């Protein structure tokens, strides 16, 4: 019982892209085209940006789901630990155990699969101005890659579906994600193994 993620570009030429923001000791998010991962922040905001060939239909909708990278991992679902769940960081439109929130959008929806009681986030595809090249969606990580009792330093990934008004696939793309102290350190550090 696994979420696919397979990359598809689809009929609307859907692309991942990213800030270009180094690995100065300051930098609060950061990504690794070498690594395909995102290292960013606790609490932080992690912009993700959506490039298409063709304008998707209005009523599309963009979900972002955790799953652990590991595949004797796959099965569990990626949650946040106890401590966090507990916390009181809540905006009021997040539930308390999802890990991945959006902030700064009114329509934001949250859900657990009734079936696979996996948590995921959703909003509604907003196209570019007719003056940029893509769409941001500002994500927030809400719990520690080191958290005990959580991820548990277990590497995860992010999976980015397209889906129309009726929740059918339209794209799909993925990358691995770090959250911790000091991303601009720890991607410097993993890409000097190269
Ligand atoms: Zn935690």
Same mark, same amino acid.
């Given at each position: ?8 570009? @689809? ?14 000791? *300051? =930098?609060?998010?950061? %990504?690794? &085209? ?69 902030? @700064? ?14 948590? *995921? =986030?959703?909003?509604? %595809?907003? &196209? ?15 719990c520690n890659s080191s958290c005990m009792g959580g991820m548990n330093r277990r590497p995860i990934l992010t999976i980015i579906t397209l889906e129309d008004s009726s929740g059918n ?17 720890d991607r410097r550090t993993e890409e000097e193994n190269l």
């Open positions: 019982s696994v979420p696919s993620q397979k990359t598809y570009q @689809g009929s609307y030429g859907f692309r991942l892209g990213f800030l270009h923001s180094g690995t100065a000791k *300051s =930098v609060t998010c950061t %990504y690794s &085209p070498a690594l395909n991962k995102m290292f960013c922040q606790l609490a932080k905001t992690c912009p993700v940006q959506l490039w298409v060939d063709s304008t998707p239909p209005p009523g599309t909708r963009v979900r972002a789901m955790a799953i652990y990278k590991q595949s004797q991992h796959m099965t569990e679902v990626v949650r946040r630990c106890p401590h966090h769940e507990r916390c009181s960081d809540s905006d009021g439109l997040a539930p308390p155990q999802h890990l991945i929130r959006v902030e @700064g959008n009114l329509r934001v929806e949250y859900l657990d699969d009734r079936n696979t009681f996996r948590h *995921s =986030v959703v909003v509604p %595809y907003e &196209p570019p101005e007719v003056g940029s090249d893509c769409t941001t969606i500002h994500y927030k990580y809400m696939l339209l794209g799909r793309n993925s990358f691995e994600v770090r959250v911790c102290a000091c991303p601009g350190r």
